[PDB]
Design a protein around this ligand. Structure first.
Ligand SMILES: Nc1ncnc2[nH]cnc12
Ligand SMILES: Nc1ncnc2[nH]cnc12
Ligand SMILES: Nc1ncnc2[nH]cnc12
Ligand SMILES: Nc1ncnc2[nH]cnc12
Ligand SMILES: Nc1ncnc2[nH]cnc12
Ligand SMILES: Nc1ncnc2[nH]cnc12
Ligand SMILES: *[C@H]1O[C@H](CO)[C@@H](O)[C@@H]1F
Ligand SMILES: *[C@H]1O[C@H](CO)[C@@H](O)[C@@H]1F
Ligand SMILES: *[C@H]1O[C@H](CO)[C@@H](O)[C@@H]1F
Ligand SMILES: *[C@H]1O[C@H](CO)[C@@H](O)[C@@H]1F
Ligand SMILES: *[C@H]1O[C@H](CO)[C@@H](O)[C@@H]1F
Ligand SMILES: *[C@H]1O[C@H](CO)[C@@H](O)[C@@H]1F
Lengths: 165, 167, 165, 167, 167, 167
């Protein structure tokens, strides 16, 4: 069980469209950087440059940039042994959801790290995410556990306490 | 081309939480039924699983692990059996269940038709890169919904997503 | 939901090493032949002939026969949309177990049809089979349900009442 | 056993660059059309995608990324939809497209029928190990081409490659 | 060859119900620990999952669906993370869990080393075709057990099963 | 981001039939050995299996089924173990083994680096669509061969094929 060399290769999936999201991503990187079971961490937003493209975020992008970037995202999933998703429960990110579905189809373990700023709302979650994810670590209450989780074995921890959408 | 018998097995993916979404799903069923290239259409919300041990089932409540396991598997089984995915994609209230399913289907190399809908046609046209590039064929829900009745599901012709801003 | 044409393509996995096993296989074929949701049924024991092989069952077989037969078994799994396994709980068949594991890795649904002649023994089952299988139909008490099960949708039915090995 | 309906869905892989190559493809379609076990035959060069933004497309020159994606994806969609691959393999002018497709299909555990063709029936028989071991069934194109009309695509019986020198 | 750092990630599959089996697993761990090509060894019976809701856990009894789900997933996660499978295969009391795992690994195209053991060396040498052909490398548990300490897990050299009757 | 240990495991795919081909492979090994991001490089022609029953094996002639299986499987095991494929692609003499391997890897969603080589740098640049769209990164062998020594195999940045006519 004890690793001769770190084998955990993380695909850190996450939205990067707001300040809070960019902040959670920043913290996750630091926490994972402290985990002795990790060999490498891949963060998709850390980019391809199409020479022909004369381009703004949210604007029309060249097909070549799209292909290269999309492949870069899939390549990270292929190289990775585990997925860690900073899941925004308030503003659902279909990019992250697609990626979680993609990883599970490849039989790779997925750590869901849900974040919410509206604790008032009843804890609900889509069935596919609740049953697709292999391990859940609460981002609001247990974020720091990422620094100690054993990514060499990726022990399961089924989602519970959440009502199904 | 020129199928002896219909070979299209559709996984009709869609959210089913609001009236507008349910209406789309109902209409999609009608249109697909008129397509001669289709052999079967699987809609995940049709038949559910019943856990005899589950006391008083609350739609939206906790729910037993047995029911969860069975239902989740039914949704994957539909993908496994299907030759193609057809998603009634809500662009106003993103459905992560739907997105998980699109990613799962593409990892299995199955073609995916995206039928996006919006109640606000005037708003900015933007799509997540994973959906814009993952999907193999797009058919606008708002203006080309009817094409589902004639689209050739025996071959599933590609039609890359274009005209959408990417973030 | 209602199929325009039958789409159920069955991989009928089963041992074929005893009289009881050969009998259960015979009955399953007849039952499935009555199910209107089935397009085709594949039974691996229905064979390749290596011209060079000068051969008896259980004896040393040529590598060419092995490859051809093994591939024939995998090809049936590939063509199939669903697996139906006449699972002998008394004399475990690793061939069938391998095949169940293979099918689930391909995300295909698996119907377990367990048979036992020793009801006395506590109902036990290996975790991998209990959790790997998607639907369970008791062969001793519900064998006939194969003639009516909807293989167009393959509805789930989790294994229960079995103690884990 | 006996199929209630034809279930074989063929991915007819083949180069389409010489007259001899296109003649074989034409003949292959005819033979398969006569096979009772076939539900559908997909030939990659049949349809084709048209890119509206592609001004004066030159077949053999630079193609738009959109056309490349749509076309490549159509080629993979056929593999996904198919239950078995049938390759009109030109042993004289190796086609990497066909070889890529054979490997892709095998990674998916799908059976692959190799139908080798040579304009020099008397020359030494040699085949790359990947092709020779990757394919699940061989039907010689020079002498057994006609067998495509009777081969049981509902079950796809093996038949390992033998008689070819391995390099 | 010539790895900069060890890359072998072993999924040590094995039954763990009898004393003889447990002894084999313990010895296998020792031998693998001496192999410089190994980076990690995962043994499914090492750390288990604890369902706080599960009252009095009875090893062999019913058991909660939550514990079942978690444990089953732990066993698949080990396969996913692993680069190679190493199965201490009991030839006297066949373990279907082990067999399921070998089939799962081969469907993912991962190499599998079979280390068969028997308490009756004089009995007929017979193996199920799926195991004999599915496995990529065989190392006899009874006479070559020690090889696990020197086998190159960075490359996993093939060694087809031979000398076993097939049924 | 920065890797704590090298994580790139390369499947160095390549034909090995001409002097020029073997010279490139030799150079490729040297360049990769200098790359800090590489943990291991697998070259299919390095080891090799020996069949005891194979009397006087002729490299190029008929090989035993046992040798064929062991060797083919070693070639697939390298792909399974690898995180990325690097192909010394001979643009003059197409190699179906390499093409099969490229397709197989892509079906597995693994990145593929194409390193094309031509003895005629001035001739028309044309590539099969499957190869041109299948590969995720291109590094010209004639002018950028040296980049293999610095390319980041821990992350494998894309770089779509462009500039080649598609057929
Ligand atoms: N890597 C990436 N994934 C998704 N959207 C993006 N936008 C910019 N870079 C991106
Ligand atoms: N089939 C289904 N899939 C996902 N969530 C559901 N909720 C109720 N039925 C469902
Ligand atoms: N198809 C088959 N599968 C397994 N063992 C066999 N023995 C003979 N035919 C067989
Ligand atoms: N389907 C196809 N595959 C490969 N090259 C092509 N050129 C035109 N159509 C093609
Ligand atoms: N890890 C495990 N896998 C399978 N069965 C088990 N029973 C107890 N622990 C187990
Ligand atoms: N590894 C290998 N792959 C293909 N052909 C070969 N001939 C000898 N070794 C070989
Ligand atoms: C793809 O999906 C998300 C963004 O929506 C990222 O995790 C990854 F790049
Ligand atoms: C899983 O995703 C959606 C619900 O969110 C359905 O299509 C399918 F059941
Ligand atoms: C492979 O496994 C069993 C025999 O042990 C059959 O189901 C199939 F042929
Ligand atoms: C892809 O490869 C060949 C042509 O090179 C076709 O079979 C298919 F379109
Ligand atoms: C699953 O199979 C066996 C137990 O039967 C273990 O190796 C693994 F946990
Ligand atoms: C299989 O294909 C080529 C040789 O044809 C090698 O890369 C690998 F061994």
């Amino acid at each position: 069980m004890k690793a001769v060399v770190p084998t955990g290769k993380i695909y850190l999936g996450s939205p990067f469209y707001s300040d809070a999201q960019r902040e959670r991503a920043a913290k996750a990187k630091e926490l994972l950087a402290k985990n002795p079971s990790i060999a490498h961490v891949f963060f998709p937003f850390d980019g391809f440059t199409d020479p022909d493209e004369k381009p703004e975020i949210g604007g029309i992008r060249s097909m070549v940039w799209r292909d290269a970037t999309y492949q870069n995202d899939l390549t990270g999933i292929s190289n990775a042994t585990c997925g860690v998703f900073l899941y925004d429960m308030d503003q659902l990110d279909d990019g992250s959801a697609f990626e979680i579905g993609f990883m599970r189809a490849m039989h790779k373990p997925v750590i869901l790290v849900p974040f919410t700023e509206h604790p008032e709302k009843e804890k609900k979650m889509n069935l596919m995410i609740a049953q697709g994810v292999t391990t859940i670590i609460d981002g609001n209450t247990e974020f720091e556990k990422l620094a100690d989780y054993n990514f060499n074995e990726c022990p399961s921890n089924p989602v519970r306490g959440y009502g199904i959408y």
